């Protein structure tokens, strides 16, 4: 089963920072990163990447080091 990395809205990080982090960590374009940031902000969370459990563990670690609230879970 594939897994997903989820980023959760938090009250401290800047919207602008989160958009930048998605570009920096995943290479996403600015429209893509902005859309994911706004999904987190307006829905409370968003899937930001998908793949094997092991690969999502890395994405979670990278996001934590950037200061974002990230978890992973199995995709159903
Ligand atoms: N640094 C700072 N001024 N903090 C106060 C809040 C700033 C505000 N940020 C938000 O509204 C965030 N909730 C946006 C956000 C955080 C995390 C994630 O993952 C997505 C979105 C602002 O930017 O004005
Ligand atoms: Mg907010
Ligand atoms: Mg966060
Ligand atoms: Mg799903």
């Amino acid at each position: 089963a594939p897994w997903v990395t989820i980023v959760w809205d938090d009250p401290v990080n800047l919207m602008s920072y989160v958009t930048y982090v998605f570009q920096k960590l995943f290479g996403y374009s600015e429209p893509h990163a902005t859309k994911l940031m706004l999904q987190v902000h307006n829905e409370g969370k968003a899937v930001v990447s998908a793949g094997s459990r092991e690969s999502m563990e890395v994405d979670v670690s990278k996001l934590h080091a950037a200061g974002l609230w990230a978890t992973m879970q199995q995709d159903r």
Side-chain angles (χ1 to χ4, degrees), residues 7-16 18 22 37 40-41 68:
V7 171
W8 299 84
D9 187 42
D10 78 74
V12 178
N13 281 120
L14 290 163
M15 294 175 291
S16 62
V18 173
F22 293 161
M37 176 279 289
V40 176
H41 205 209
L68 303 192

Side-chain angles (χ1 to χ4, degrees), residues 1-5 49-53 55-61 71-75:
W3 285 58
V4 292
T5 296
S49 64
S52 68
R53 183 177 179 163
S55 71
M56 296 300 91
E57 185 185 3
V58 174
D59 288 359
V60 170
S61 293
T71 61
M72 69 178 193
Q73 61 186 44
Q74 180 198 324
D75 205 358

